[PDB]
Amino acid sequence: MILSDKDIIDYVTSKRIIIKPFNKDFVGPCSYDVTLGDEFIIYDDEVYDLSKELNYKRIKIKNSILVCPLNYNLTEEKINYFKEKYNVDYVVEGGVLGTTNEYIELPNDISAQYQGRSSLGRVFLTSHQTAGWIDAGFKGKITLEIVAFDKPVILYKNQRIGQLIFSKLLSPADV
Amino acid sequence: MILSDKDIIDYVTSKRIIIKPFNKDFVGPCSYDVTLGDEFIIYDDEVYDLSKELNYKRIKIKNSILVCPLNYNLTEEKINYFKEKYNVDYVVEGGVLGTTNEYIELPNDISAQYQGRSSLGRVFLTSHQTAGWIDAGFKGKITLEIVAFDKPVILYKNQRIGQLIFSKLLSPADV
Amino acid sequence: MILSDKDIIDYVTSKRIIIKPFNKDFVGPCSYDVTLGDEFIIYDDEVYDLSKELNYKRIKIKNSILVCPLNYNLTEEKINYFKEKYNVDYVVEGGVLGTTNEYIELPNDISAQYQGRSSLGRVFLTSHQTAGWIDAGFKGKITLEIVAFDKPVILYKNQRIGQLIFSKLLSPADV
């Protein structure tokens, strides 16, 4: 069973589900809206080999980022053009990792699923490459896997980026 | 808990869940198949900035559409080649928005998830860029976020495009 | 309600859910990890028309495969370069189908959802193009829909590739 608005409020009130920061206006009928952080990771190795430690750079934006589809031919002139035209701080192509602002802790009897916002899916911007279920017992911010699939998309710091849907477990998990 | 076939039938019968049109043959073990509409939206601005109103054109197909991956080099000659070879009415690359034929209304105690058809996922055609949970209380057709990720894919008007999975809420939502 | 670890163990023990092979170490708090098979399918027609029978070749790898994003300009020299540098047996671009090692059977009162591993989603490698719910009553291995969206990704035979999440149905399905 999926937690309704009033269940989300109860679970947050009693600290069964931790959400930091929490804004009651982000509680929907059966979900909780989460927001986009200002820190991003971009990988800079040639290939991804998960048997090795991955090299990355960390980027922090002031206000906004333009996320371009893979293979956009981003010359330095094209980047300046986008920065001046759309007032973005950073222009990237292909995948970038972001984070929610929100830190969560899930109890042993709840699993949550992260879903990107449908307004963004309608412009072919994704913030998750998987279905996004999160283990009972999880503690952390949510790592966002961001890719644009059609045209460049402007993302703003602190914008609503996605939602958490909470489900009851049938029985409590071991941790 | 996910509604089984017999639950879907009960909820449709009593008008708890509205599905228009409804075909009982589309009820699966624990889902309801939905179908592809003939109307599509294609964006025609340079970038997607959701702080602004988005400019789009609306396309209506007679029978079928060829959806090509982004950056397919669609010359006007290549388009004619595809139209004559595969008998499609329209050829597009990158993202296009479609719709289900089906209009739904969800009660305060059900959330539904849209999932694209696995026969289509196996040819790398997606009709949703997000996990696809739909709020309790939702009324509307489902907007499809269509992208091909490998080779062009022919889609046919009225074909089964995806499924709705219905879940009980733990408690009724406020609207 | 989602099955916890102890529920997964009960259901496997009594043969309500069949998982072959089964490794108890793959049981998580509320999911079961599945692994990557050594057999892949690659399509070799020009377009995907699901009204026709699809032509494919079958590839079997010894150890590992490099999955490159669509439109990677894989010359035969670039392929040799990747094979020698990263010790992979096969180099592919765009979509490829794989399979889990695990064969499952679901009873009439459970639906399962396949989700790709988050370590892989964080490198923009997907193994499912849909939300991945599987019918109550399903029997089979899980077909993986594999695409890389940023840079090439090495996948290893038998690696953990994704997870199954099991949910109770509200009522038993008819088959």
UniProtKB/Swiss-Prot annotation, chains A, B, C:
The active site is at 145 (proton donor/acceptor). GO terms for molecular function: dCTP deaminase (dUMP-forming) activity; dCTP deaminase activity; nucleotide binding. HAMAP family: dCTP_deaminase. It comes from the Archaea. This is dCTP deaminase, dUMP-forming. The keyword Magnesium applies. InterPro entries: dCTP_deaminase, dUTPase-like_sf, dUTPase_trimeric. Changing residue 145 to Q: Loss of dCTP deaminase activity, but retains 25% dUTP pyrophosphatase activity. Belongs to the dCTP deaminase family. Homotrimer. Two trimers assemble into a hexamer by stacking on top of each other. Bifunctional enzyme that catalyzes both the deamination of dCTP to dUTP and the hydrolysis of dUTP to dUMP without releasing the toxic dUTP intermediate. It also acts as a dUTP diphosphatase with a lower affinity for dUTP than for dCTP. Keywords: Hydrolase, Magnesium, Nucleotide metabolism, Nucleotide-binding. Gene3D superfamilies: 2.70.40.10. DCTP binds at residues 117-122, 128, 132, 135, 143-145, 163. Inhibited by dTTP.
